[PDB]
């Protein structure tokens, strides 16, 4: 028995086009071009889930550094004091105090100076 193609080809192609909504020009209209853009967007999105974790950690470091310099310290010589004193607060929380609740950041920095001296 013959099996004529129908309702199956356009169903799969239309699904790919709708995934290319908002692209400039024909990239949101034509299947051949939109297929290459949807494949490429996935490859980008896959490797920015890796870069996103690197990009933020560089942001927290640059904010702890700026706040630490106001107390006659630097990032390299502050993060050594905390480890040598036993405090295990990570960068994300440390940067949060430096912006919102700078009062407590100084209390942590004072303990860092005590560890360095003794």
């Amino acid at each position: 028995p013959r099996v004529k193609g129908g309702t199956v080809t356009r169903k799969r192609r239309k699904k790919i086009v709708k995934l290319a909504k908002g692209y400039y020009g024909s990239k949101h209209l034509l299947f051949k071009v939109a297929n290459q853009a949807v494949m490429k967007s996935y490859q980008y999105a896959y490797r920015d889930r890796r870069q996103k974790k690197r990009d933020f950690r560089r942001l927290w470091i640059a904010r702890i550094n700026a706040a630490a310099r106001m107390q006659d310290l630097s990032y390299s010589k502050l993060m050594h004091g905390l480890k040598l004193a036993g405090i295990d607060i990570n960068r994300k929380m440390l940067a949060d105090l430096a912006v919102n609740d700078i009062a407590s950041f100084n209390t942590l920095a004072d303990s860092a100076k005590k560890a360095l001296a003794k």
Partner: protein, 143 residues
């Protein structure tokens, strides 16, 4: 999740006066290029302008160690065939001290659309008097 991002106009931008007599050309420019960027504030945000305004006076007394006053050359090309022109750093300091410090700093700033914005934040005067006394700047001591 929850990481603070600044907004345009949320951070107060100050004015600073920097005296540039005797300091090396590249040692001064390096510190100024981070004041305009905003890298001295915990409110730092990479995609938002959050720096300070800087006024530089005594631009004619800048330092040039070694034989830089004669052996350092600044090139310009006008895109016409054989249109390369050059000036030494020594006579540039004598005649146009404001251009020497702007060229040095402009290469120390990001080369993007926001990097041009920070450039317009810099005023250089070859003498010892500035026209921005209405903004009430402060004296910033270089580290």
């Amino acid at each position: 999740r929850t990481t603070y991002m600044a907004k345009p106009g949320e951070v107060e931008r100050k004015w600073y006066v920097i005296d540039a007599t005797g300091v090396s050309l590249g040692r001064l420019s390096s510190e100024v290029a981070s004041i305009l960027r905003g890298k001295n504030k915990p409110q730092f945000t990479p995609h938002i302008d959050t720096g300070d305004f800087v006024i530089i006076i005594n631009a004619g007394k800048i330092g040039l160690t070694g034989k830089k006053a004669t052996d350092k050359i600044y090139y310009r090309h006008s895109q016409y065939p054989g249109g390369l022109k050059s000036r030494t750093a020594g006579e540039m300091r004598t005649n146009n001290p404001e251009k020497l410090l702007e060229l040095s700093i402009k290469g120390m700033l990001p080369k993007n659309s926001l990097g041009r914005q920070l450039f317009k934040k810099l005023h250089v005067y070859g003498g010892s008097e500035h026209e921005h006394a209405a903004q009430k700047p402060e004296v910033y001591e270089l580290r």
